[PDB]
Amino acid sequence: VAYWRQAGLSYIRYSQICAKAVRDALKAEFKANAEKTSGSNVKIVKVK
Amino acid sequence: ASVVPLKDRRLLEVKLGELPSWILMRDFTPSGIAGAFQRGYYRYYNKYVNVKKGSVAGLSMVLAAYVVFNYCRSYKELKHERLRKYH
Amino acid sequence: IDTAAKFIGAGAATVGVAGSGAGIGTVFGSMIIGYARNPSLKQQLFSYAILGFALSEAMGLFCLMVAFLILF
Amino acid sequence: IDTAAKFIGAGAATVGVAGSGAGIGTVFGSMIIGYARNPSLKQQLFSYAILGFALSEAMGLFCLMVAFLILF
Amino acid sequence: IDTAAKFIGAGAATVGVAGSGAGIGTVFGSMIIGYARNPSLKQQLFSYAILGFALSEAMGLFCLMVAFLILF
Amino acid sequence: IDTAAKFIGAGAATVGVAGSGAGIGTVFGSMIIGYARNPSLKQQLFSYAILGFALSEAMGLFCLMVAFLILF
Amino acid sequence: IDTAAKFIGAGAATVGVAGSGAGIGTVFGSMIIGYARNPSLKQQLFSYAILGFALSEAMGLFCLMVAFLILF
Amino acid sequence: NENLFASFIAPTMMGLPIVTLIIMFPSLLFPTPKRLINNRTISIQQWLIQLTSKQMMAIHNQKGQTWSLMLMSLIMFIGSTNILGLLPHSFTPTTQLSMNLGMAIPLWSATVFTGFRYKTKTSLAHFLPQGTPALLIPMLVIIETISLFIQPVALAVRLTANITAGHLLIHLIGGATLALLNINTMTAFITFTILILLTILEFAVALIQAYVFTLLVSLYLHD
Amino acid sequence: PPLPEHGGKVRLGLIPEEFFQFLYPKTGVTGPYVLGTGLILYLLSKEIYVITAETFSAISTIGVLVYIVKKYGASIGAFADKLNEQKIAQLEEVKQASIKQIQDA
Amino acid sequence: GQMSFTFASPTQVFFNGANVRQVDVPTQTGAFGILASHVPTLQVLRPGLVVVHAEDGTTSKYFVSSGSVTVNADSSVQLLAEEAVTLDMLDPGVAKANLEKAQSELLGAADEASRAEIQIRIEANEALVKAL
Amino acid sequence: FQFTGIKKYFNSYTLTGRMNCVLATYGGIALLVLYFKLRSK
Amino acid sequence: DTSTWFITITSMIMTLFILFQLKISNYSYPASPESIELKTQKHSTPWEMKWTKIYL
C-alpha cells in the first residue's frame, strides 16, 4: 500500500508516469527511441 | 625570555618536521623534502622507517618529552624504593 | 525494626512495574509496523491496540495493589 | 535505624524506571523500521509514537515518585 | 549505621541504567535494518535514532543521579 | 559493619551491566538480517554496528565505575 | 562475618553473567531469519555471528572475574 | 584450585596538578601554515577536517550555518584531550567534572536563547507535538519539559563518567599484572586483555561524535 | 580449531628463526658497535632507582603505536596522494585559463 | 552457481541464459540481493538502478523504471523491465530542473487523486538524481 | 591581535553564547554548599 | 578524586577557545577553488558579447 494505493489508481497508471519521466531526461540523440515506442495510437470505441 | 622560548620551537620545527612552503622559503621547503629525518632516525633502532611522508621521528620526540616531563610530578607519590637499588 | 522490613519490601515490590514498562513498549511499537503496511486503522487495529495496552497494565497494576498491601 | 530503611527502600524503588528504559528502546526503534516502508509520518505514524512515548513514560516517572514519597 | 545503609542504598540504585544499557542496543539495532531496506538515512532515518537515543539516555544517568544524592 | 555494606553495594552495582550484555546481542543479531538482505557490508551498515556497539559499551562499563568507588 | 560478607557479594555478581545469555539468544537466533532469505553460508554471514557470539560472551566473562575479584 | 588471581589494594588518585599548562598543550600539536602547498603532516590534519565539516554542515542548511564553524573546534579539543591521556603518566582535563559543567551550560543555553531572539513563540511551542487529543495534555507538558532540563546534565555527565571509567580498568587490569608473582602462565592473558582494552579505549574519539552531534540535534531541533 | 593453533606455532617456528637471523645482525656488531653501551647504563642505573610501578600499560600503549608505523608506510601515499591530487587541479586550471585567454584575442 | 539471469526490454535483450552470481534489484517494498539460491518471490519494481555484478572483473549499472522480478523454484530468475536504459543516455542537467517544478504543482493541486499523481512524479525524479 | 582575527565572530554568536552567568550562578551557589559542610565539619 | 570546590579549570577553558579559533580559522577549502573558475568564464564570454555587440 502507498499513496497511489487507497486513492483509486492502478499499477499501469503508476507505471505510465514513472516511465514517462525517463523519456524526458534523455538527451537529444536518444529522443527518437522515446518517440519510437510512444504507444498512443489505439482508439476507444464503446457502444454507449 | 619570550623570544628565547619562541626561537626554540622554530628551530625544532624547521629542522626535524616539516619545513613548509611560501616562497622566500621555496628552497627551504624542499630542504625538508629530503628532511632531517635521516638525522632523526638513529635513536630508536631502525624500525620506525615510515617517516618519509608521515614523519614519526618528527612527532614522536615531543610525545617522548611529554612523558618524561610528567614522570617528575608522579615521582613524589609512588616512591616505593627501599634502602637499596633494584635489580 | 518493624519499619525496617516494611520500607524495603515496598520498594522491592515496585520493581514489578518495570516489567510492565517493557511489555507496554512493544504494543505501541508493533502497531507502528503493523499499521505501516496496511492503512485500515479505524478498524480493529486500534481496538486491538487499546486491549493490548490495558492488559499489560493489569499485570503491572496488580502488583501495585499488592505493593500498597505490604504497607497496610 | 528508621532512616536506615528510608534510604535502602528508595534504592530498589528507582529500578522501576529502568523498565521505562528498555521499553522505550523498542518503540523508538520501531519508528525506524516502519518509516521507510511507508513515508506518511505527518499523519498518525508519528502521533502513535508520541502516545507510545508518553504513556510509556508515565510508568517511568510514577516509579520515581515512589522514591520521593517513601523517603519524606 | 547511617553510612552503611547508604553503601547498599546506592548499590541497588546502580542498576537503573540497565534498562537504558540495552534499550540503546535495540534502536541502534533497528537502523542497521532500516538503512538496509531503503537507503535514505540522510533524511529522518538517522535523526530518528539520535532523537531515540537522547530520549532514552535521558533515563540512564537519571537514576545514577539519585544514587549520588542518596550517597552524599 | 559496613565492611559487608562495602561488598553488597558493590555486589548489587555489577548487575546493572546485564542490560548491555544483551544490548549488544541485539545489534549483532540485527546486523546479519540487515546484511543477508543487502550485501553491501563495506558501506555504512557495518559502520553502524560499531557506533551502536561503542554507544552501548559506553553505557556498559561506567556501571562498573560505581562498583569500584563503593569498594575503594 | 568475614565469610558472611564475601559470598553474598559473589553470588549477586554472577547474575550479570547470565545477563548476556539473552543477547546470544538474539545473536545465534537471528542467524536463522538471515540464512533463509539468502544461502551464502560460508561468507561473512556465519562469521559475523562469531563477531557477535564471542563479543557478547565478552561481556558475559567480563563480570565473572569481578566476582572472583571479591571472592578473595 | 589451579590459577589463583591476586589483587592489590591501593588508592586510585585523580589528583589535581597545575592544569593551565596541560590545557594549552594540545593546541601546539596542531600547526597552521601560511602557504599554498603544505608539508605532509599538516596536510593530513587539513584533510581530516574537510571530512567532518561536511557532516555537521549537511543537516542544518540554513542561516544557522554560521554556528557550525565553531562546532569543529569543539571536536578537536576533546578529540585531542581524550587521546593524549592514553600515554603512560599523562593527565586529561576532561577527567574532572568541573570543566564539563562549563562546556555544557554555556553551549546548551546558547541554543534555547537562539530561537527566543527570533521566533519568540514557536521555539517552545515545539512542546505541542500534534493534533491535540484531550486526555493527555497535562501528562505531556510535564514530561517534555522534564526531559528538556535534563539535557545539560545529560550532556556533561555522559562524558566525564565513561572517560574516567576507561582509566580505572587500565590501572586495575594493569595492576594485577604487577601483583601476579604467582603462576606465570596467566600473566600473559591479563597482558593480552590490556592490549585489546587499549584498542577499545580509542573509542575516546568515538565519544566526541556523540558530543558535537547531540549538540547539533539540540541545535537543529530548536532552530 | 586444529589448523589455527599450528598456524601460530608455525609462526613460533618462524619467529625463532627470524630472531636467529636478527641475532646474526648483532654478531656483525661483535666488534664495531660503540653506541648502545654508552647509554645502556643510564637505563640500568635509573632502573635501579625508581622506575618500577603499575606501568606495564606503558609498554602496551607504546606497543600499539608500533603497529601503526606499519600502516604509516601506506600513509605516505594518502598524504602523498593528497598532495598529488591537489597538484593536478592547479595544472588543469592554468591550462584551462590559458586556452580561453589566447583564443578570445 | 547454476543460476540463470534474463534481462529483457520490450524492444531489446540484454541477458539470455547468462548468470553472474549476484543481482541487485530495487523492489517496490524494499530491496534485496540475489546470491545463488535465494528463497523465491514474486516482486514488482520501483524506480531505481539495477547494478548487475558481472563475473568479468566489473559490474553493469543499468537503470530500470517499472518491471517485475520473478525468482523461481529452480535457481533461475526472470527480470523483465519496461524502460531499462544505461546511465550515459541520461542527462543529469535536465533531471535537476524537473524536480522542483513538480514540487511547485504539488501545492497547486485541488483534487485528492490528482495530487496523488503528483506524488508519483516527484518520487521518480528523486531516484533519478541520486543515482547520478 | 588575539581579538581582531575573531572579533567578527564574537558579536555574532556571543549574544547567546556568552551567557556564562548561568554557569556563574550555578557555579557560585555550588561554592556555597561545600564551604558550609566543612564549617559544620 | 571525588574532587571538590570547582574554582579551578573552567576559567582556563575559555582562554583555550581563543587559541582553537585562531588556528582552525586559517584553513583552506578545496571547493572554493572550483568556484573562481566559473566566474572567469562568464566574464570574458560577456566581454566577447561586448565585442560581438561592438560588431553588431
mmCIF file of N, CA and C in Angstrom, chain H residues 12 14 16 19-20 23-24 26-28 30-32 45-46 49 72-73 76-77 96-99 103, chain L residues 1 3-6 8-10 12-13 15-17 19-24 26-31:
data_model
loop_
_atom_site.group_PDB
_atom_site.id
_atom_site.type_symbol
_atom_site.label_atom_id
_atom_site.label_comp_id
_atom_site.label_asym_id
_atom_site.label_seq_id
_atom_site.Cartn_x
_atom_site.Cartn_y
_atom_site.Cartn_z
ATOM 1 N N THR H 12 43.352 4.958 44.093
ATOM 2 C CA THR H 12 43.379 5.365 42.698
ATOM 3 C C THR H 12 43.140 6.867 42.625
ATOM 4 N N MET H 14 42.960 10.570 41.213
ATOM 5 C CA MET H 14 42.760 11.644 40.255
ATOM 6 C C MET H 14 43.159 12.947 40.927
ATOM 7 N N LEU H 16 45.137 16.775 41.360
ATOM 8 C CA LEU H 16 44.924 17.951 40.532
ATOM 9 C C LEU H 16 46.205 18.768 40.459
ATOM 10 N N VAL H 19 47.034 22.790 36.005
ATOM 11 C CA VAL H 19 46.211 22.446 34.857
ATOM 12 C C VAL H 19 46.376 23.383 33.676
ATOM 13 N N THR H 20 46.648 24.669 33.914
ATOM 14 C CA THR H 20 46.562 25.629 32.814
ATOM 15 C C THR H 20 47.745 25.526 31.862
ATOM 16 N N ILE H 23 46.160 22.245 29.668
ATOM 17 C CA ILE H 23 45.097 22.584 28.731
ATOM 18 C C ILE H 23 45.678 23.165 27.453
ATOM 19 N N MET H 24 46.686 24.027 27.581
ATOM 20 C CA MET H 24 47.220 24.722 26.416
ATOM 21 C C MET H 24 48.031 23.793 25.522
ATOM 22 N N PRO H 26 47.658 20.579 24.072
ATOM 23 C CA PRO H 26 47.151 20.099 22.775
ATOM 24 C C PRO H 26 46.650 21.185 21.844
ATOM 25 N N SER H 27 47.067 22.433 22.012
ATOM 26 C CA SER H 27 46.911 23.386 20.925
ATOM 27 C C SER H 27 48.143 23.403 20.046
ATOM 28 N N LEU H 28 49.316 23.239 20.649
ATOM 29 C CA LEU H 28 50.555 23.355 19.894
ATOM 30 C C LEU H 28 50.918 22.058 19.185
ATOM 31 N N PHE H 30 48.908 21.093 16.855
ATOM 32 C CA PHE H 30 48.369 21.385 15.536
ATOM 33 C C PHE H 30 48.932 22.713 15.057
ATOM 34 N N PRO H 31 49.709 22.733 13.997
ATOM 35 C CA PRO H 31 50.185 23.994 13.434
ATOM 36 C C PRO H 31 49.265 24.473 12.320
ATOM 37 N N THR H 32 49.516 25.689 11.858
ATOM 38 C CA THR H 32 48.759 26.263 10.753
ATOM 39 C C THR H 32 49.673 26.945 9.741
ATOM 40 N N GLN H 45 46.145 16.600 8.554
ATOM 41 C CA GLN H 45 45.228 17.222 9.503
ATOM 42 C C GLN H 45 44.202 18.062 8.759
ATOM 43 N N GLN H 46 44.626 18.712 7.670
ATOM 44 C CA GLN H 46 43.741 19.577 6.903
ATOM 45 C C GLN H 46 42.704 18.773 6.137
ATOM 46 N N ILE H 49 39.689 17.466 8.642
ATOM 47 C CA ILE H 49 38.638 18.426 8.959
ATOM 48 C C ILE H 49 37.636 18.496 7.820
ATOM 49 N N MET H 72 33.393 22.617 14.930
ATOM 50 C CA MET H 72 34.538 21.791 14.570
ATOM 51 C C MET H 72 35.770 22.151 15.389
ATOM 52 N N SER H 73 35.703 23.228 16.166
ATOM 53 C CA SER H 73 36.767 23.468 17.126
ATOM 54 C C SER H 73 36.486 22.709 18.401
ATOM 55 N N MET H 76 37.861 19.064 18.060
ATOM 56 C CA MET H 76 39.301 18.832 18.046
ATOM 57 C C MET H 76 39.894 18.939 19.441
ATOM 58 N N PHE H 77 39.251 19.696 20.324
ATOM 59 C CA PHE H 77 39.790 19.854 21.668
ATOM 60 C C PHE H 77 39.563 18.594 22.498
ATOM 61 N N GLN H 96 38.092 15.561 35.129
ATOM 62 C CA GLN H 96 37.432 16.246 36.226
ATOM 63 C C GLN H 96 36.075 16.746 35.762
ATOM 64 N N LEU H 97 35.107 16.763 36.675
ATOM 65 C CA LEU H 97 33.733 17.074 36.294
ATOM 66 C C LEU H 97 33.499 18.580 36.233
ATOM 67 N N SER H 98 34.538 19.368 36.505
ATOM 68 C CA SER H 98 34.362 20.806 36.648
ATOM 69 C C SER H 98 34.165 21.479 35.305
ATOM 70 N N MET H 99 35.067 21.238 34.360
ATOM 71 C CA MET H 99 35.016 21.993 33.115
ATOM 72 C C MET H 99 33.890 21.510 32.220
ATOM 73 N N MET H 103 31.276 23.265 29.859
ATOM 74 C CA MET H 103 31.179 23.051 28.417
ATOM 75 C C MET H 103 29.738 22.810 27.999
ATOM 76 N N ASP L 1 40.082 13.170 43.974
ATOM 77 C CA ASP L 1 39.313 12.118 43.329
ATOM 78 C C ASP L 1 37.905 12.638 43.136
ATOM 79 N N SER L 3 36.251 15.244 43.549
ATOM 80 C CA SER L 3 37.376 16.165 43.673
ATOM 81 C C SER L 3 37.266 17.260 44.734
ATOM 82 N N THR L 4 36.670 18.426 44.407
ATOM 83 C CA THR L 4 35.783 19.347 45.143
ATOM 84 C C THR L 4 35.814 20.721 44.477
ATOM 85 N N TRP L 5 34.876 21.592 44.838
ATOM 86 C CA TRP L 5 35.110 23.026 45.028
ATOM 87 C C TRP L 5 35.332 23.900 43.781
ATOM 88 N N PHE L 6 35.717 23.305 42.650
ATOM 89 C CA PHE L 6 35.480 23.786 41.278
ATOM 90 C C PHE L 6 35.974 25.170 40.829
ATOM 91 N N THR L 8 38.764 26.166 40.015
ATOM 92 C CA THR L 8 39.789 25.818 39.056
ATOM 93 C C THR L 8 39.166 25.668 37.671
ATOM 94 N N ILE L 9 39.631 24.686 36.912
ATOM 95 C CA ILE L 9 39.809 24.590 35.470
ATOM 96 C C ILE L 9 38.941 25.451 34.557
ATOM 97 N N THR L 10 37.688 25.733 34.939
ATOM 98 C CA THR L 10 36.702 26.235 33.975
ATOM 99 C C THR L 10 37.007 27.649 33.502
ATOM 100 N N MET L 12 40.060 28.357 32.807
ATOM 101 C CA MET L 12 41.200 28.107 31.941
ATOM 102 C C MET L 12 40.779 27.308 30.715
ATOM 103 N N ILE L 13 39.468 27.192 30.479
ATOM 104 C CA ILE L 13 38.988 26.511 29.279
ATOM 105 C C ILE L 13 38.600 27.522 28.209
ATOM 106 N N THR L 15 39.983 30.505 27.747
ATOM 107 C CA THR L 15 41.193 31.013 27.124
ATOM 108 C C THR L 15 41.645 30.079 26.017
ATOM 109 N N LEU L 16 41.311 28.788 26.128
ATOM 110 C CA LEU L 16 41.716 27.849 25.094
ATOM 111 C C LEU L 16 40.895 28.043 23.830
ATOM 112 N N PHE L 17 39.662 28.525 23.970
ATOM 113 C CA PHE L 17 38.843 28.737 22.781
ATOM 114 C C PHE L 17 39.066 30.135 22.218
ATOM 115 N N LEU L 19 42.489 30.139 21.356
ATOM 116 C CA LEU L 19 43.529 29.505 20.553
ATOM 117 C C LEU L 19 42.938 28.741 19.380
ATOM 118 N N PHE L 20 41.971 27.864 19.649
ATOM 119 C CA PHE L 20 41.493 26.951 18.620
ATOM 120 C C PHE L 20 40.694 27.671 17.557
ATOM 121 N N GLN L 21 40.163 28.843 17.877
ATOM 122 C CA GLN L 21 39.508 29.641 16.854
ATOM 123 C C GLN L 21 40.515 30.514 16.124
ATOM 124 N N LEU L 22 41.791 30.410 16.489
ATOM 125 C CA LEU L 22 42.806 31.132 15.740
ATOM 126 C C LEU L 22 43.489 30.226 14.735
ATOM 127 N N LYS L 23 43.768 28.984 15.125
ATOM 128 C CA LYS L 23 44.459 28.070 14.226
ATOM 129 C C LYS L 23 43.543 27.605 13.110
ATOM 130 N N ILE L 24 42.358 27.121 13.471
ATOM 131 C CA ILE L 24 41.485 26.374 12.574
ATOM 132 C C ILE L 24 40.784 27.359 11.647
ATOM 133 N N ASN L 26 42.319 29.580 9.896
ATOM 134 C CA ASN L 26 43.144 29.706 8.704
ATOM 135 C C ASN L 26 43.286 28.347 8.046
ATOM 136 N N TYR L 27 42.197 27.847 7.473
ATOM 137 C CA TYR L 27 42.239 26.607 6.716
ATOM 138 C C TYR L 27 41.789 26.925 5.294
ATOM 139 N N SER L 28 41.931 25.935 4.425
ATOM 140 C CA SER L 28 41.584 26.091 3.024
ATOM 141 C C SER L 28 40.609 25.019 2.587
ATOM 142 N N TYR L 29 39.613 25.430 1.818
ATOM 143 C CA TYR L 29 38.621 24.503 1.320
ATOM 144 C C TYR L 29 38.888 24.275 -0.158
ATOM 145 N N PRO L 30 38.929 23.005 -0.547
ATOM 146 C CA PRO L 30 39.171 22.615 -1.939
ATOM 147 C C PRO L 30 38.068 23.128 -2.859
ATOM 148 N N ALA L 31 36.834 23.099 -2.368
ATOM 149 C CA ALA L 31 35.681 23.545 -3.131
ATOM 150 C C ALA L 31 35.733 25.019 -3.539
#
